[PDB]
Amino acid sequence: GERPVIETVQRAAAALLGASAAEVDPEAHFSDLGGDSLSALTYSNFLHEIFQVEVPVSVIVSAANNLRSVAAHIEKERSRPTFASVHGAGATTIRASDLKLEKFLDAQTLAAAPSLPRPASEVRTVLLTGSNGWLGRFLALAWLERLVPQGGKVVVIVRGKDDKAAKARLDSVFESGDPALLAHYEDLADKGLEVLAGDFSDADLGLRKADWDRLADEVDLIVHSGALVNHVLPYSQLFGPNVVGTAEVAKLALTKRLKPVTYLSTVAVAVGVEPSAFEEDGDIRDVSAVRSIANGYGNSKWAGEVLLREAYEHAGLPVRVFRSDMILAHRKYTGQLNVPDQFTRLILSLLATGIAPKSFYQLDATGGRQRAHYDGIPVDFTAEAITTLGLAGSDGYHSFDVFNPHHDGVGLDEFVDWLVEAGHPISRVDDYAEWLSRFETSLRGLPEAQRQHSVLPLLHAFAQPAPAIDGSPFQTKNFQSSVQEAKVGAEHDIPHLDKALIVKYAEDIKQLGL
């Protein structure tokens, strides 16, 4: 450097986050100093310009990495598939034809892949990614409930300095003030959960070579729920976690014996296509073969689907893709809701400000409230459905759109009615434009703790009232009919969102102390 690299790394962090330059010890972590994925991008671009090497946001925010690791990464880079080698350096568009398995996996794996032994008839061991995430924790719990009674095992890869720290990170997400959940988790975890520290963007999933080789022999099925889920980051930042990560998962599925892959995806892969032309269960390579650079998020998840489709075509790897956005709170376990998402932020904001519009949707010609539907599914149903259908996917390639398709007239205005019925003081402001300005003023007047958990960062989305759509514009038949045939839950169908769920949001928000 000029100047050793670690010093520039510490000073930049100190400047960016407002620490004292003695509190920016090289063993400290970016998140412990007040950092998050917004400031991590600023940091990444700053160090990128100074040292002329890529410093991905994933390296900065990972629980395994401290500021020393960031410095080490920079110096290693100055003296592994990338955006340049796959899509061409500085490219402004991307193509499905770019994403071939030859660019991610070695030739020996690919050559031996077509003739590999077929999936095991009985699933006893499952590898799960993203288990400390919002959806993944309940996928983990669903698999433990099934496999522990049959003497089976759930293997889990979590980011952390070592296996101990990784397990502690997973343990803590089940601590939400619900004693029954914690006892249920700990009972099952002792009997059937193996936690390994790792990182799916790295080679051999960031594991010890002996563990990777063991899993290639031992794992019957792979559930890939892990990803960097960020709607503002560009495709270049999400390439490592979401595209290369998916390729590394596929590599394990195409070694020793074939392992069916459940892959989590998003409605954001339909960005660039009209909703009516988006075939739920079509070939994703045909449904959008070319794309421009939630744009990066959508593109990254799309790219993962393409690679898994290539793996199916090359070796007959069974795949089940599940496209899911806005996975709402657990209906039974208290304190279990996705705190950062837009829906939770909105509900918290309405309770904090105590004011709501006559309608979030467009009014009719006579100024009245129209019929509308909120597309959302609770996590407890979603986890059971994905696990049931994924377990049944030992042959072929199929995709499901995990959305709420009901033409039931249950939307945001009904949720506000239900909060008022339950006793929460929410006033109904008649004019939408008057609401929005009053809402923004009241939000800005809240304490610092509450403002950061509010919807204030996402206020641009509420500028105009949304269009009054009942049902969902995307096709769901494959998911809904499969759920009906499999007879999932009490409903034997995708559930309707109800008063009990909305009332529970308010109690969850209080219980977590927001």
Side-chain angles (χ1 to χ4, degrees):
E2 311 141 329
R3 279 278 159 278
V5 172
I6 189 57
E7 256 187 341
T8 311
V9 167
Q10 301 165 259
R11 291 175 188 186
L16 179 56
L17 304 171
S20 244
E23 138 170 49
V24 285
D25 155 56
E27 294 156 316
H29 301 249
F30 191 73
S31 53
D32 295 345
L33 297 161
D36 57 350
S37 50
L38 299 180
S39 49
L41 182 62
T42 307
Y43 196 57
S44 173
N45 291 335
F46 190 69
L47 298 169
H48 178 51
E49 293 279 285
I50 292 163
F51 296 107
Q52 299 297 332
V53 294
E54 288 218 315
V55 187
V57 167
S58 216
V59 170
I60 296 152
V61 303
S62 173
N65 294 352
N66 54 17
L67 298 184
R68 183 83 57 177
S69 312
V70 177
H73 174 85
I74 291 162
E75 275 170 329
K76 220 165 295 238
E77 265 297 4
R78 292 160 89 204
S79 43
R80 220 74 227 121
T82 59
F83 182 64
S85 75
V86 175
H87 297 297
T92 194
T93 64
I94 52 169
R95 306 188 261 93
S97 54
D98 303 339
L99 300 157
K100 304 303 198 199
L101 297 169
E102 294 92 50
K103 301 194 188 175
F104 297 87
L105 281 58
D106 68 280
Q108 253 207 61
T109 319
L110 298 174
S115 63
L116 277 159
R118 292 293 301 170
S121 185
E122 298 211 309
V123 176
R124 299 283 184 271
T125 305
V126 172
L127 175 63
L128 173 61
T129 312
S131 70
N132 68 300
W134 169 235
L135 176 56
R137 73 187 69 162
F138 297 112
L139 297 175
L141 208 61
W143 279 109
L144 285 166
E145 287 164 9
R146 288 167 172 73
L147 296 171
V148 167
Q150 317 184 51
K153 298 255 191 222
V154 180
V155 184
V156 138
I157 293 168
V158 178
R159 294 201 290 185
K161 213 190 306 284
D162 68 323
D163 298 332
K164 254 164 143 72
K167 177 157 161 55
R169 288 186 74 233
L170 180 56
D171 287 358
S172 63
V173 306
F174 295 98
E175 189 100 24
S176 62
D178 193 303
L181 176 57
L182 183 55
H184 185 52
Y185 169 68
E186 286 179 341
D187 177 44
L188 296 169
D190 291 345
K191 297 180 166 57
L193 186 65
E194 186 184 335
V195 185
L196 297 169
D199 186 317
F200 50 66
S201 70
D202 297 339
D204 296 328
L205 302 161
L207 302 175
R208 298 181 211 87
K209 183 60 173 156
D211 285 326
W212 191 94
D213 288 332
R214 182 172 56 82
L215 297 179
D217 192 70
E218 194 171 314
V219 174
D220 299 313
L221 189 145
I222 298 165
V223 180
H224 187 211
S225 182
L228 180 42
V229 182
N230 190 294
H231 299 141
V232 301
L233 289 169
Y235 181 78
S236 53
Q237 293 287 359
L238 303 169
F239 188 83
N242 301 353
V243 190
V244 179
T246 305
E248 288 296 329
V249 171
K251 179 168 193 222
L252 183 60
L254 300 164
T255 303
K256 273 208 190 92
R257 58 193 181 86
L258 287 173
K259 299 170 196 72
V261 175
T262 291
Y263 179 67
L264 273 288
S265 190
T266 176
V267 74
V269 307
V271 167
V273 195
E274 52 273 300
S276 302
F278 188 71
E279 282 176 30
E280 179 177 31
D281 200 11
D283 191 323
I284 195 63
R285 297 168 300 178
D286 301 348
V287 178
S288 216
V290 178
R291 283 161 144 287
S292 182
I293 58 165
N295 162 275
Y297 178 55
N299 284 310
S300 71
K301 297 303 299 183
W302 171 80
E305 285 189 47
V306 172
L307 293 168
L308 289 165
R309 193 55 176 252
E310 291 292 335
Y312 169 64
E313 291 290 326
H314 184 89
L317 180 70
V319 184
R320 293 294 184 281
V321 175
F322 296 89
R323 311 204 181 85
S324 54
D325 295 70
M326 290 308 154
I327 299 177
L328 306 185
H330 210 284
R331 286 176 300 176
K332 315 201 164 181
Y333 301 131
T334 58
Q336 286 295 331
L337 77 178
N338 194 11
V339 177
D341 80 18
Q342 189 177 302
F343 189 80
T344 311
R345 288 176 182 285
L346 178 56
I347 297 297
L348 185 147
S349 299
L350 294 168
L351 295 164
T353 62
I355 54 165
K358 183 182 176 181
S359 184
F360 287 91
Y361 307 96
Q362 285 191 50
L363 306 150
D364 68 349
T366 192
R369 200 182 96 177
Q370 298 196 103
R371 191 190 178 80
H373 177 74
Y374 186 78
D375 183 4
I377 304 178
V379 73
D380 62 283
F381 174 87
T382 305
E384 279 294 307
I386 290 169
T387 301
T388 304
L389 300 177
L391 182 55
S394 54
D395 283 301
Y397 190 108
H398 292 288
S399 295
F400 299 107
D401 285 344
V402 182
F403 314 140
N404 185 337
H406 296 300
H407 294 82
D408 60 9
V410 178
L412 295 168
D413 301 342
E414 280 70 31
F415 303 159
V416 172
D417 296 351
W418 289 333
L419 292 167
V420 171
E421 286 171 23
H424 295 100
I426 298 170
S427 306
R428 263 282 165 75
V429 192
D430 197 349
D431 184 59
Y432 187 82
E434 194 196 325
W435 172 70
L436 186 60
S437 54
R438 286 185 61 186
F439 189 57
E440 200 199 332
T441 328
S442 193
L443 281 166
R444 267 177 219 293
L446 299 166
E448 175 131 54
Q450 298 176 18
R451 290 198 319 272
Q452 109 221 133
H453 294 307
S454 86
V455 83
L456 182 55
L458 303 163
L459 251 258
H460 61 85
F462 296 85
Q464 293 297 326
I469 279 73
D470 199 25
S472 178
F474 301 97
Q475 80 189 36
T476 54
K477 168 263 182 276
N478 196 24
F479 183 60
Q480 183 164 27
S481 69
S482 297
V483 151
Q484 287 169 5
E485 272 167 3
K487 302 177 174 204
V488 178
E491 308 91 352
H492 289 192
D493 196 7
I494 294 157
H496 300 268
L497 303 181
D498 65 331
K499 180 168 178 170
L501 180 60
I502 303 306
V503 170
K504 179 167 184 292
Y505 265 90
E507 286 286 308
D508 284 344
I509 286 160
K510 189 169 71 172
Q511 179 172 311
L512 294 177
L514 296 137

mmCIF file of all heavy atoms in Angstrom, residues 211-227:
data_model
loop_
_atom_site.group_PDB
_atom_site.id
_atom_site.type_symbol
_atom_site.label_atom_id
_atom_site.label_comp_id
_atom_site.label_asym_id
_atom_site.label_seq_id
_atom_site.Cartn_x
_atom_site.Cartn_y
_atom_site.Cartn_z
ATOM 1 N N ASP A 211 -15.277 -33.058 5.355
ATOM 2 C CA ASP A 211 -16.719 -32.870 5.549
ATOM 3 C C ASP A 211 -17.476 -32.800 4.218
ATOM 4 O O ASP A 211 -18.517 -33.437 4.077
ATOM 5 C CB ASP A 211 -17.012 -31.634 6.410
ATOM 6 C CG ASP A 211 -16.705 -31.860 7.890
ATOM 7 O OD1 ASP A 211 -16.884 -32.992 8.392
ATOM 8 O OD2 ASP A 211 -16.297 -30.894 8.563
ATOM 9 N N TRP A 212 -16.950 -32.052 3.247
ATOM 10 C CA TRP A 212 -17.555 -31.977 1.908
ATOM 11 C C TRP A 212 -17.646 -33.359 1.253
ATOM 12 O O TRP A 212 -18.695 -33.716 0.718
ATOM 13 C CB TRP A 212 -16.779 -31.012 1.003
ATOM 14 C CG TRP A 212 -17.478 -30.688 -0.292
ATOM 15 C CD1 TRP A 212 -18.293 -29.616 -0.543
ATOM 16 C CD2 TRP A 212 -17.416 -31.436 -1.509
ATOM 17 N NE1 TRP A 212 -18.741 -29.650 -1.845
ATOM 18 C CE2 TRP A 212 -18.220 -30.757 -2.460
ATOM 19 C CE3 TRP A 212 -16.761 -32.611 -1.893
ATOM 20 C CZ2 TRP A 212 -18.387 -31.225 -3.774
ATOM 21 C CZ3 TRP A 212 -16.922 -33.074 -3.198
ATOM 22 C CH2 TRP A 212 -17.730 -32.382 -4.123
ATOM 23 N N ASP A 213 -16.556 -34.126 1.316
ATOM 24 C CA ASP A 213 -16.527 -35.500 0.794
ATOM 25 C C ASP A 213 -17.527 -36.412 1.504
ATOM 26 O O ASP A 213 -18.173 -37.234 0.854
ATOM 27 C CB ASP A 213 -15.119 -36.118 0.900
ATOM 28 C CG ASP A 213 -14.119 -35.522 -0.094
ATOM 29 O OD1 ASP A 213 -14.523 -35.056 -1.185
ATOM 30 O OD2 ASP A 213 -12.905 -35.541 0.215
ATOM 31 N N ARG A 214 -17.650 -36.266 2.824
ATOM 32 C CA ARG A 214 -18.633 -37.030 3.611
ATOM 33 C C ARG A 214 -20.081 -36.705 3.204
ATOM 34 O O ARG A 214 -20.894 -37.615 3.056
ATOM 35 C CB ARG A 214 -18.458 -36.777 5.118
ATOM 36 C CG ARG A 214 -19.419 -37.565 6.011
ATOM 37 C CD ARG A 214 -19.089 -37.426 7.492
ATOM 38 N NE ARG A 214 -19.049 -36.026 7.930
ATOM 39 C CZ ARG A 214 -20.104 -35.274 8.254
ATOM 40 N NH1 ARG A 214 -21.353 -35.748 8.208
ATOM 41 N NH2 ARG A 214 -19.907 -34.012 8.629
ATOM 42 N N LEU A 215 -20.389 -35.421 3.026
ATOM 43 C CA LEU A 215 -21.731 -34.991 2.618
ATOM 44 C C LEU A 215 -22.097 -35.452 1.203
ATOM 45 O O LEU A 215 -23.253 -35.785 0.947
ATOM 46 C CB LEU A 215 -21.884 -33.467 2.733
ATOM 47 C CG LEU A 215 -21.745 -32.864 4.135
ATOM 48 C CD1 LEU A 215 -21.894 -31.350 4.064
ATOM 49 C CD2 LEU A 215 -22.731 -33.456 5.130
ATOM 50 N N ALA A 216 -21.117 -35.480 0.298
ATOM 51 C CA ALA A 216 -21.302 -36.033 -1.051
ATOM 52 C C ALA A 216 -21.750 -37.505 -1.041
ATOM 53 O O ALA A 216 -22.486 -37.941 -1.928
ATOM 54 C CB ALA A 216 -20.026 -35.873 -1.862
ATOM 55 N N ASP A 217 -21.305 -38.252 -0.036
ATOM 56 C CA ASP A 217 -21.709 -39.642 0.170
ATOM 57 C C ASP A 217 -23.020 -39.778 0.976
ATOM 58 O O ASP A 217 -23.843 -40.641 0.681
ATOM 59 C CB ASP A 217 -20.576 -40.385 0.897
ATOM 60 C CG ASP A 217 -20.769 -41.890 0.909
ATOM 61 O OD1 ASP A 217 -20.653 -42.511 -0.166
ATOM 62 O OD2 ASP A 217 -21.024 -42.450 1.997
ATOM 63 N N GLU A 218 -23.201 -38.920 1.981
ATOM 64 C CA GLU A 218 -24.202 -39.109 3.047
ATOM 65 C C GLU A 218 -25.554 -38.411 2.805
ATOM 66 O O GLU A 218 -26.600 -38.943 3.191
ATOM 67 C CB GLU A 218 -23.589 -38.614 4.363
ATOM 68 C CG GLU A 218 -24.305 -39.022 5.641
ATOM 69 C CD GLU A 218 -23.506 -38.681 6.891
ATOM 70 O OE1 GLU A 218 -22.287 -38.949 6.931
ATOM 71 O OE2 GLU A 218 -24.099 -38.138 7.843
ATOM 72 N N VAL A 219 -25.530 -37.240 2.166
ATOM 73 C CA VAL A 219 -26.725 -36.413 1.970
ATOM 74 C C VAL A 219 -27.641 -36.998 0.884
ATOM 75 O O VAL A 219 -27.190 -37.277 -0.224
ATOM 76 C CB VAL A 219 -26.346 -34.953 1.603
ATOM 77 C CG1 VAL A 219 -27.574 -34.111 1.256
ATOM 78 C CG2 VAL A 219 -25.586 -34.303 2.752
ATOM 79 N N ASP A 220 -28.925 -37.146 1.210
ATOM 80 C CA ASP A 220 -29.939 -37.651 0.276
ATOM 81 C C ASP A 220 -30.647 -36.543 -0.510
ATOM 82 O O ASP A 220 -31.031 -36.758 -1.657
ATOM 83 C CB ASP A 220 -30.978 -38.488 1.028
ATOM 84 C CG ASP A 220 -30.366 -39.697 1.721
ATOM 85 O OD1 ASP A 220 -29.569 -40.415 1.079
ATOM 86 O OD2 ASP A 220 -30.682 -39.936 2.906
ATOM 87 N N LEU A 221 -30.814 -35.371 0.105
ATOM 88 C CA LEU A 221 -31.556 -34.249 -0.491
ATOM 89 C C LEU A 221 -30.986 -32.907 -0.015
ATOM 90 O O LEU A 221 -30.546 -32.793 1.123
ATOM 91 C CB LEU A 221 -33.036 -34.373 -0.107
ATOM 92 C CG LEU A 221 -34.060 -33.441 -0.770
ATOM 93 C CD1 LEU A 221 -35.384 -34.160 -0.982
ATOM 94 C CD2 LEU A 221 -34.292 -32.170 0.036
ATOM 95 N N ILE A 222 -30.995 -31.902 -0.888
ATOM 96 C CA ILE A 222 -30.450 -30.579 -0.569
ATOM 97 C C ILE A 222 -31.529 -29.506 -0.711
ATOM 98 O O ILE A 222 -32.169 -29.398 -1.753
ATOM 99 C CB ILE A 222 -29.251 -30.208 -1.479
ATOM 100 C CG1 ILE A 222 -28.094 -31.196 -1.272
ATOM 101 C CG2 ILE A 222 -28.773 -28.790 -1.181
ATOM 102 C CD1 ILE A 222 -27.029 -31.153 -2.350
ATOM 103 N N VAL A 223 -31.710 -28.710 0.341
ATOM 104 C CA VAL A 223 -32.647 -27.594 0.337
ATOM 105 C C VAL A 223 -31.813 -26.324 0.348
ATOM 106 O O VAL A 223 -31.171 -26.011 1.349
ATOM 107 C CB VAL A 223 -33.575 -27.636 1.572
ATOM 108 C CG1 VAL A 223 -34.560 -26.474 1.558
ATOM 109 C CG2 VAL A 223 -34.332 -28.952 1.616
ATOM 110 N N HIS A 224 -31.822 -25.601 -0.766
ATOM 111 C CA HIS A 224 -31.040 -24.385 -0.892
ATOM 112 C C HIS A 224 -31.919 -23.153 -0.748
ATOM 113 O O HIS A 224 -32.431 -22.608 -1.733
ATOM 114 C CB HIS A 224 -30.259 -24.380 -2.204
ATOM 115 C CG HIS A 224 -29.308 -23.232 -2.325
ATOM 116 N ND1 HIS A 224 -28.992 -22.665 -3.536
ATOM 117 C CD2 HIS A 224 -28.626 -22.526 -1.393
ATOM 118 C CE1 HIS A 224 -28.144 -21.670 -3.351
ATOM 119 N NE2 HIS A 224 -27.909 -21.562 -2.058
ATOM 120 N N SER A 225 -32.060 -22.724 0.507
ATOM 121 C CA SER A 225 -32.815 -21.524 0.897
ATOM 122 C C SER A 225 -31.928 -20.292 1.135
ATOM 123 O O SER A 225 -32.436 -19.176 1.262
ATOM 124 C CB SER A 225 -33.628 -21.820 2.168
ATOM 125 O OG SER A 225 -34.417 -20.708 2.549
ATOM 126 N N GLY A 226 -30.614 -20.486 1.199
ATOM 127 C CA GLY A 226 -29.695 -19.395 1.491
ATOM 128 C C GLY A 226 -29.380 -18.529 0.281
ATOM 129 O O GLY A 226 -29.193 -19.032 -0.828
ATOM 130 N N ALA A 227 -29.300 -17.224 0.518
ATOM 131 C CA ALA A 227 -29.003 -16.232 -0.507
ATOM 132 C C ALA A 227 -28.843 -14.868 0.151
ATOM 133 O O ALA A 227 -29.281 -14.664 1.284
ATOM 134 C CB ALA A 227 -30.122 -16.170 -1.536
#
